[PDB]
Design a protein around this ligand. Sequence first.
Ligand SMILES: CC1(C)C=Cc2c(ccc3c2OC[C@@H](c2ccc(O)cc2O)C3)O1
Ligand SMILES: CC1(C)C=Cc2c(ccc3c2OC[C@@H](c2ccc(O)cc2O)C3)O1
Lengths: 115, 115, 115, 115
Amino acid sequence: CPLMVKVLDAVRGSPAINVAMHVFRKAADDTWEPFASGKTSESGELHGLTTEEEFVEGIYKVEIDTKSYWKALGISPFHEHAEVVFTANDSGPRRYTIAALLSPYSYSTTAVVTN
Amino acid sequence: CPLMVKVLDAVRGSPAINVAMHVFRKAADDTWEPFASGKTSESGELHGLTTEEEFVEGIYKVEIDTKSYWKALGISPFHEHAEVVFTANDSGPRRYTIAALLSPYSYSTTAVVTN
Amino acid sequence: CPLMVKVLDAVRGSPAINVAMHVFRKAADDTWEPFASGKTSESGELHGLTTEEEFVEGIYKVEIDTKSYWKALGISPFHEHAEVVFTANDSGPRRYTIAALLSPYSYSTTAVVTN
Amino acid sequence: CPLMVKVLDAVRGSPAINVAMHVFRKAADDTWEPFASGKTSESGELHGLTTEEEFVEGIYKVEIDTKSYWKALGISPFHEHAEVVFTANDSGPRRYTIAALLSPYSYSTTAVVTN
Ligand SMILES: CC1(C)C=Cc2c(ccc3c2OC[C@@H](c2ccc(O)cc2O)C3)O1
Ligand SMILES: CC1(C)C=Cc2c(ccc3c2OC[C@@H](c2ccc(O)cc2O)C3)O1
């Protein structure tokens, strides 16, 4: 698939399991339209969000529900969520892997983009 | 100073200078209301965004224009911008330092919350 | 395998390919003994460093040659290398995944430990 | 102050206080020579490690006792310690800020190198 997200937990040293996230695409009228959504598996991965045909050129936002994740573990975290906003497929189709590391008061994200 | 942002550059090993950001507060209708804004100084710091009187409880969004930063350095960035979204003062007013570290395909942010 | 390392490049948004690393184990005399070594593949992964039988309880050090990596790309980085030092298998055999993200002046590492 | 270290805690959203570290300089025989040491203050900072006269070109290692830090908080950590190894002053004397962010299974460090 052309878009997948993997989430790790820096407190437990484990994948971050059952983490919900919503993907949006920027529309012509500059609003965010719902594009896809899912949650991470027991390996902390979310696959199959979209397809090569559906995943057209555009600006995308992945909003990761880190707050509910920490809350379910008894932690009151700093962030409401973690976002990743990027232009995709500008120079042709690419595959995107979004990696996120979660702590109660911190997060890191990086992107691996391949042809 | 109840809210301070500090931005570092992971490619050049320096403060990230002249980085523009806007701070929003979530309104009752769930849209983002402009609240404050500024550019990081030569030390990568942005101060005096708000005061303790004005900085009431609510959900705040700091949107950092990382894309313009990398473009000025002649480097192609992944993200459109970096966001930090958080609930402020849920236990009564505190002081917030938001630290962000920027790379072209990655960013890390952490909060320091003091009394 | 019980120990694998994956390395990403935060400047290129890609795996960090052909990154050399050496693993050492702490000996009885408190010296570092060579344990295994390898380099990352085109997916930025290094597998097959060791086996369940060989990978006994101990303190291990993974020393990642980040300097040569950046140098080969024309960058003079801050760090000589990135280390990860940890006690392994203290409560019984585990599988360790070491993830590292590289920038010229920064690095991040996290560990995923599973049974 | 030519060398300063600042440590943050990603679980508690605070400076990491009373974190002990030692700084070493590589000797001609490739062993690590004690050079300086201290504990982070209430602001997570450690200053006055060295002076511009004494801080000559060489390879320096800052070894941060992250393990003792987490143990005192009652939290099981992955790493034995965190290291930062770097060549200093290769273009003539500069000022170094080493920033480290600590989680139980992860750490991030970045350098700010100023003139
Ligand atoms: C989160 C990460 C990866 C590691 C620590 C870090 C950072 C970006 C910015 C800053 C960080 O910690 C130090 C902090 C800081 C710098 C100067 C200062 O005077 C006070 C501070 O609290 C700024 O990236
Ligand atoms: C620590 C930080 C900042 C955030 C997560 C991260 C990383 C560097 C490398 C990897 C990271 O998480 C995903 C991980 C990974 C990638 C592919 C895969 O198949 C399995 C994995 O565990 C690799 O940097």
